[PDB]
């Protein structure tokens, strides 16, 4: 409906886990999120953090407001629980694949609700905990979330990677496979 | 055992810079938006029956209305004219184009903003949706079915705001 759209003050909170998040977005990309534990603002692009200051306490203040509204809305609706949904994962690389070159593998996961998930990277059915960084829970128009995980890898000789996803709405985890060269 | 979620969304809509600005706040419970403020309307209007208490209660407080109406300037305009004009709007990332094979494929990656114009003068080509890498870069995959020894393909032309001249990589 417009040339640019900014999301300022997007707040999420869950009652059973006592878990929420506060983010800012512009034109569909994440500007930052507020680490509730460390009480600090983590900008998605560090260069933009040197130009713009957002004190984290503002984020924590919106979290506390939705934390309270959740207790109110949980009574207002007759304790309607969240409907677990089925996330649709997808795997693709950042730049064109070159055999023996460095590239980043992405596991796009869409239609996430509730925002509780476990995105794990496996190398030929081998647990990989190194070189993985995931974005926060980005938001969609139907009020479901999508979360992206990144894996830096050197493609060669059929490594057979796959991305495992654990969600309440999934009785069995969904694994998407990818290989090249 | 059971799970409950609440979401609040502050949304600023800019068209033609700051010429027209639209503020929309959304209070959401378990995927259901119940009350929203819209700067076109000027007050809180309930979206579902869940929102009726809030919309009636917040409209009775002239301060909530005053503060909320002011957020089109103190949040939408302020963030665009300052932080966004100094960061996201100025950001230009030139694309990386490269032609490979398997049907020839032209991969255009790592560019910003979204506006791009990838072309080969030959039609019969399938292009994917603009892929949003969540690292503030995009990529587009333009793929044409290729036959053998059909001369040397002219170019995979690429047009982008970051580029003053197209890349026009030859096959």
């Amino acid at each position: 409906e417009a040339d640019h759209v900014g999301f300022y003050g997007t707040t999420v909170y869950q009652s059973p886990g006592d878990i929420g998040q506060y983010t800012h977005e512009f034109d569909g990309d994440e500007l930052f999120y507020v680490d509730l534990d460390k009480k600090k603002t983590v900008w998605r692009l560090p260069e933009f953090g040197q130009l713009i200051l957002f004190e984290p306490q503002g984020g924590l203040q919106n979290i506390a407001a939705e934390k309270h509204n959740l207790g109110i809305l949980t009574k207002r609706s007759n304790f309607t629980p969240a409907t677990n949904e089925a996330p649709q994962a997808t795997v693709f690389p950042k730049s064109p694949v070159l055999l023996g070159q460095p590239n980043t593998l992405i596991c796009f996961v869409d239609n996430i609700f509730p925002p509780v998930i476990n995105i794990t990277w496996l190398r030929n059915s081998k647990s990989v905990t190194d070189g993985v960084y995931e974005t926060s829970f980005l938001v969609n128009r139907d009020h479901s979330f999508h979360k992206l995980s990144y894996l830096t890898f050197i493609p060669s000789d059929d490594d057979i990677y796959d991305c495992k996803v654990e969600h309440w709405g999934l009785e069995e985890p969904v694994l998407k496979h990818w290989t090249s060269g | 055992e059971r799970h409950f979620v609440v979401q609040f969304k502050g949304e600023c809509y800019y068209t033609n810079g700051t010429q027209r600005i639209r503020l929309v706040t959304r209070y959401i419970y378990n995927r259901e938006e119940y009350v929203r403020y819209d700067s076109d309307v000027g007050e809180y209007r309930a979206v579902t029956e869940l929102g009726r208490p809030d919309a009636e209660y917040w409209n009775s407080q002239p301060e909530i209305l005053e503060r909320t109406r002011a957020e089109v300037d103190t949040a939408c305009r302020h963030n665009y004219e300052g932080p966004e004009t100094s960061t996201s709007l100025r950001r230009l990332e030139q694309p990386n184009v490269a032609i490979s094979l398997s049907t020839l494929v032209c991969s255009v990656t790592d560019f910003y903003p979204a506006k791009i114009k990838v072309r080969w003068e030959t039609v019969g080509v399938s292009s994917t949706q603009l892929i949003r890498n969540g690292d503030w870069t995009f990529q587009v995959l333009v793929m044409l079915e290729m036959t053998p020894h059909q001369g040397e393909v002219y170019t995979c032309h690429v047009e982008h705001p970051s580029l003053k001249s197209p890349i026009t990589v030859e096959w």
Partner: peptide
């Protein structure tokens, strides 16, 4: 950076 504030819901 400016923010939009969250109202407290009607309570009863």
């Amino acid at each position: 950076e400016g923010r939009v504030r969250v109202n407290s819901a009607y309570q009863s």
